[PDB]
Design a binder for this molecule. Sequence first.
Ligand SMILES: Cc1cc2nc3c(=O)[nH]c(=O)nc-3n(C[C@H](O)[C@H](O)[C@H](O)COP(=O)(O)O)c2cc1C
Ligand SMILES: C=C(C)[C@@H]1CC=C(C)C(=O)C1
Ligand SMILES: [Mg+2]
Length: 399
Amino acid sequence: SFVKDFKPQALGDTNLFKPIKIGNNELLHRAVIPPLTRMRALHPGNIPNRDWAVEYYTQRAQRPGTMIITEGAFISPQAGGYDNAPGVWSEEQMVEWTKIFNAIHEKKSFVWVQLQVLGWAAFPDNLARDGLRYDSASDNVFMDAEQEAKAKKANNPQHSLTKDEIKQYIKEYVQAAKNSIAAGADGVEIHSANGYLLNQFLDPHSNTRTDEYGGSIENRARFTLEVVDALVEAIGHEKVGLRLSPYGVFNSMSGGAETGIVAQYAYVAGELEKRAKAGKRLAFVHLVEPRVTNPFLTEGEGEYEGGSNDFVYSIWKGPVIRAGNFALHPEVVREEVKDKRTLIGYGRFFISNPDLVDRLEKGLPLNKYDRDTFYQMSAHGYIDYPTYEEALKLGWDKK
Ligand SMILES: Cc1cc2nc3c(=O)[nH]c(=O)nc-3n(C[C@H](O)[C@H](O)[C@H](O)COP(=O)(O)O)c2cc1C
Ligand SMILES: C=C(C)[C@@H]1CC=C(C)C(=O)C1
Ligand SMILES: [Mg+2]
């Protein structure tokens, strides 16, 4: 059915429908699909779903000139820990990704691979099963008590990465990015948000290190920036973006409660602009808004009102993608896109609306999403959400 207490507003008269160039890609509108883990990848091998993934992405690429960022993809086995999330390290995996990229391109849309490394959000028992470490920035602070317990129970205690192990991850990021581009992707997004490994280094709660990778703003940012620099050199700055969530609390990050948090993220933005002025401007910075500090919470919950991401705009002068509860708030989007370098990511409602861009343009009702099938091993709630046309044929305007 359609979202009941929603008054759509047509956005076709705004900058949301003005073209913009991101990296090498000529976008025809500024509604972006942010990365959305769907847990349909197949085990063993973290293989993109051979049955349904091409169809899922094809459906959501249907509006020409759409930028799609893939679900997080693990750069290596050690970077993983979820059996049903895909990887980008193996030939088996890349074969399936190539089919996905080809399908998206056939619809005249674009695809950026999000490179994911879980750190303390990984399941320690899956990792132990495969002979892998349970990794994070530190070893004396844990995501929650349950994760700490699972780690100890599996004889896989949380491990504070050595400098050599950090370098090994960087090598893996480089190879994963190369794999992605070679298979046909338009670029990659470095995931440094949402409380995953790079975010665990950025955040002073999760990073209690006393070496060069902790203990100061510059040190906490080091790993993220090293990855940025490694990828820029490997595949080019025009093929690289960075995702950050300054106010996020998901996966036990500090958010606005940490008084030093804006400084931490301002420093990263500054270092990116510095590289930009040196002729290596990243394709974009992607920010999760304080509108959504935890994406497991229903829209309107977990909104932090005490901070804004606007500071980034004073520092970074390139494109900014903003994500977080925008689908139900066209009135907010209308104001945000008045800034001529701002794009809008729509997550949960792109899950439920394959033709979301058309609906945004014309102010059409939105399909409700089904949270119960966000992560189920099923075509249901993955590839069977209807377009507006199909919804009308199903009688949803009367349901
Ligand atoms: C089911 C689901 C899966 C997600 N997977 C990822 C992911 O793999 N990588 C990532 O950076 N963010 C992920 N997110 C966060 C979203 O990209 C987005 O920031 C968040 O959903 C808020 O946007 P929205 O209100 O438009 O949904 C996910 C969110 C949801 C609900
Ligand atoms: C279900 C997942 C593994 C996560 C859901 C939400 C976020 C922000 C991710 O990065 C993946
Ligand atoms: Mg149900």
